[PDB]
Design a binder for this molecule. Structure first.
Ligand SMILES: [Zn+2]
Ligand SMILES: [Zn+2]
Ligand SMILES: [Zn+2]
Lengths: 176, 85, 95, 214, 140, 101
RNA sequence: AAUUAUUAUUAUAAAUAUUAUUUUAAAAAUAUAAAAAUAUUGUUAAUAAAAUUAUCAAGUUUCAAAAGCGUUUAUUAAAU
């Protein structure tokens, strides 16, 4: 069934199993509390959690500081699909000093293809109400021309538009 | 039973205008222009349900507290009238 | 073409960060050029490296109201009109 | 609204008459049954601009004003557009919810005072400005002999030296007597017509002109 | 709400259409992005993610305000996963980074959260109709 | 149905939405929104952008028949021709925006 | 899926379009139940896990027998 390795990004909803469990939605907000609360849950993402084992050896101490993110240029150069031997971070760089550039993996390009089709969707909605706030906005503006031209006509032709009776049934301010 | 960009109103909706129920377009009096209203809460029904009293659904515990502020404590102004003309 | 450099998208986002550093010290402010916190390990400040073909949903935002966009850097095409415009930043100091 | 039906006799409020409504006399035997007193679905009053533009120009004159004697002021303006004490109160509910007026019980006393709210206070100051800007056009004295009232320019300026608060006291009853003569020889008759907006809320569009009878 | 207990809704966990006639609950005029600080369109739009954290007052007259694209973690610069953020000194920080953790790239959408716009995702909680004693009802 | 005989006709076409006659491009000029784009908002997104969609077969237009010439899907439905400038400009990612080297 | 059929193919994203396929003058069964006094299990192999509700849709308690929470083609002291 369309192996997940085919989808550009692994699918959002992940269907499972469980003959005796019927619910489409994956229970997020539980996969979130664990992970945020427990540091260990997610593999260290080697670099940000290496660089110890390289400070301890060369400095005789625990690093005792926040490790830099964004692995140094030159690390994980033989790896090809890092994405796990890292966080989902990109393959760091060459061992260069050139400005950081995303190595346009098939994945990064897809994200570009989202943040353009997100701006696309929010733009096709943003200007429906912009023209919807002309149609109804100008329909009212015109409808009040109607009640005005009806307002003018209904005085010379004297149609009080309040029943068969004269205003003497109105002046009582009863039902009648 | 409908509010505003900054204000409120009240209206009982029929079946015919069920489309405009969620969010309307109306003359916001705390302004001078038509402005889109919302549906802050229910205030009853437009007709009877079969075999039921006049107030079948009942307005709310909520839309009543909105009413008890509009009509409610008018004790600032039984002056200039109470109900007479 | 004579000298009009084929500017990849990475460049026209590297020439934006340079131009945004110029406008700052053209506004008189301190030109905190982004790539002068950039060292051999990446951002010396221990921050997540800002990768240059920057997404259009992560545009570098400075809360000082500096405008740099594609309309800005497209005329800075050839080699010469940057070595004089961004002279002060691309050139290292040897004193 | 008739004399003896909902209200006691002689309470023919001397305010803007409704147009075409014949005021007929009811015998002084009248009384509803103990249940018809209450059915009596009245006619809804305009609360739109022209009353809410007119009421506030009152409450802008008499900035702190005891609610009780408020109605005795709107009667005084030549441009009273208000049918009766009921219409005022409904407009006064409107202008209350708009945020224009704000009743506060006058702590030293036991009566409320329609205070023009400071939120929309700078709006009515402009609003009273346009009407006065557009009202002084009509008068036949403003333009025929402007110097007859040029005697007023200096006086009132030097009046505000010694007795400004006592000057207008007599001026207040003076106009109250001169606006009544007008209100015998012309009133703002209100001709209204219902209309249904696109949302099915039947309401009335109004307008007002001055009927000349002499 | 007040809703003493055993009277709140049960299956969806929250009542639809929080009526708020007591206080009108409108977007203010002196409104601005918490993360970005640029003024926010008044109300004509749903480009802003208006998180009214129940009664907030402190972030703004009402609760925090963010344009949909300023709703990222400030420190790590990616999306706020599961939308729980951590207001670090007036710049919304991602809870995991704001908590000290370091795993700093998500899978699905990096620089834009999954959030709803204009409180439409925040109206599952907070200030239902009886927000107080509100006994003016049955009293005389 | 004021027909007296219902059919593919005398089915009153819009017994609602009485606020007809919208001048889109004229209104689109007030909003400054690329007149070719705005008109696309008001037809099923199949018809304008490169999206998966379902077409009726008569809509597709027939081969040159003995009775009628080849009636292409365009020359009978001009305002339904997809505009692939407007697609690409909006929906697809350009080589330019990710050119890194 | 034999079809223009039960049928949102949910990879994504978005949130106010006045987007547009459903015959018709009756009572039986039946699918079905709005409404409505008493009665509360006397029905039955056995009532009570048995649609929705703005009247906001939830039985409480005791005893005896009974492990793990996963997993199964006649679905459980099955097999883990
Ligand atoms: Zn308003
Ligand atoms: Zn923002
Ligand atoms: Zn973060």
């Amino acid at each position: 069934r369309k192996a997940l390795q085919s989808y550009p990004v692994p699918p959002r909803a992940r269907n499972y199993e469980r003959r005796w469990s019927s619910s489409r939605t994956n229970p997020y907000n539980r996969m979130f509390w664990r992970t945020v609360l427990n540091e260990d849950f997610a593999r260290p993402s080697f670099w940000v959690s290496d660089f110890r084992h390289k400070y301890l050896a060369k400095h005789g101490m625990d690093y005792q500081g926040r490790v830099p993110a964004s692995p140094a240029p030159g690390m994980y150069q033989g790896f090809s699909d890092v994405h796990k031997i890292l966080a989902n971070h990109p393959k760091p760089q060459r061992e260069s000093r050139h400005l950081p550039v995303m190595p346009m993996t098939p994945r990064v390009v897809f994200e570009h293809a989202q943040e353009k089709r997100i701006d696309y969707a929010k733009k096709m909605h943003r200007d429906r109400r912009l023209v919807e706030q002309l149609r109804t906005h100008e329909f009212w503006g015109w409808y009040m021309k109607l009640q005005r031209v009806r307002g003018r006509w209904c005085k010379e032709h004297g149609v009080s538009s309040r029943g068969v009776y004269g205003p003497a049934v109105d002046a009582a301010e009863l039902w009648g | 039973n409908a509010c505003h960009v900054p204000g409120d109103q009240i209206f009982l909706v029929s079946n015919s205008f069920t489309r405009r129920l969620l969010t309307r377009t109306d003359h916001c009096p705390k302004c001078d222009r038509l402005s889109t209203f919302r549906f802050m809460s229910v205030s009853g029904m437009v007709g009877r349900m079969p075999y039921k009293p006049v107030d079948t659904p009942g307005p709310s515990y909520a839309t009543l507290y909105w009413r008890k502020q509009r009509s409610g404590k008018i004790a600032s102004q039984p002056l200039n009238e109470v109900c007479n003309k | 073409q004579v000298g009009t450099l084929v500017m990849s998208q990475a460049m026209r986002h590297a020439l934006m960060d340079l131009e945004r550093a110029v406008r700052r010290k053209e506004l008189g402010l301190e030109p905190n050029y982004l790539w002068d916190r950039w060292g051999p390990i990446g951002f010396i400040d221990g921050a997540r490296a800002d990768y240059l073909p920057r997404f259009e949903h992560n545009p570098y935002v400075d809360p000082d109201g500096v405008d740099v966009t594609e309309i800005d850097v497209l005329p800075f095409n050839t080699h010469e009109q940057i070595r004089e415009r961004y002279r002060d930043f691309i050139e290292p100091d040897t004193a | 609204f008739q004399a003896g039906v909902h209200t006691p006799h002689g309470s023919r409020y001397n305010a803007a008459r409704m147009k075409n409504w014949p005021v007929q006399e009811v015998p002084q035997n009248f009384n509803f049954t103990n249940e018809q007193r209450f059915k009596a679905k009245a006619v809804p009053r305009d609360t739109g601009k022209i009353p809410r533009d007119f009421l506030l120009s009152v409450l802008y004159r008499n900035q702190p004003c005891e609610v009780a004697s408020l109605w005795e002021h709107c009667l005084h303006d030549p441009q009273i557009v208000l049918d009766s004490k009921r219409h005022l109160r409904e407009v006064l509910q409107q202008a209350r919810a708009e945020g224009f007026v704000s009743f506060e019980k006058d702590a030293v006393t036991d009566r409320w005072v329609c205070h023009l709210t400071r939120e929309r206070f700078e709006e009515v100051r402009a609003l009273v400005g346009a009407r006065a800007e557009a009202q002084d056009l009509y008068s036949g004295l403003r333009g025929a002999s402007a110097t007859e009232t040029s005697a007023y320019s200096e006086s009132f300026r030097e009046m505000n030296e010694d007795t400004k608060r006592e000057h207008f006291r007599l001026l207040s009853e003076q106009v109250a007597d001169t606006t009544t003569h007008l209100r015998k020889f012309q009133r703002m008759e209100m001709d209204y017509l219902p209309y249904t907006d696109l949302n099915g809320k039947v309401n009335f569009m109004w307008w007002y002109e001055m009927s000349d009878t002499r | 709400t007040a809703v003493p207990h055993e009277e709140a809704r049960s299956r969806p966990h929250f009542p639809a259409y929080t009526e708020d006639v007591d206080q009108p609950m409108v977007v203010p005029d002196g409104v601005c992005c918490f993360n970005c600080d640029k003024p926010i369109d008044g109300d004509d739009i749903n480009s802003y993610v208006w998180v009214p954290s129940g009664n907030a007052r402190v972030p703004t007259t009402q609760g925090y305000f963010f344009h949909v694209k300023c709703f990222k973690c400030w420190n790590c610069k990616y999306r706020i996963i599961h939308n729980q953020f951590y207001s670090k000194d007036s710049r919304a920080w991602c809870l995991s980074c704001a908590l000290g953790r370091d795993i700093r790239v998500p899978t699905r959408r990096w620089h834009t959260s999954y959030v709803n716009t204009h409180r439409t995702g925040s109206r599952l909680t907070g200030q239902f109709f009886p927000r107080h004693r509100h006994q003016m009802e049955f009293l005389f | 149905y004021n027909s007296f005989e219902r059919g593919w006709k005398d089915k009153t076409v819009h017994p609602l939405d009485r606020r007809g006659r919208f001048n889109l491009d004229e209104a689109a000029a007030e909003l400054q929104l690329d007149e070719a784009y705005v008109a696309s908002l008001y037809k099923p997104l199949h018809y304008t952008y490169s999206m998966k969609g379902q077409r009726y077969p008569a809509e597709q237009g027939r081969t040159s028949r003995p009775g009628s010439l080849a009636a292409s899907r365009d020359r009978m439905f001009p305002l339904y021709r997809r505009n692939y400038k407007l697609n690409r400009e909006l929906r697809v990612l350009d080589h330019r925006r990710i050119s890194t080297d």
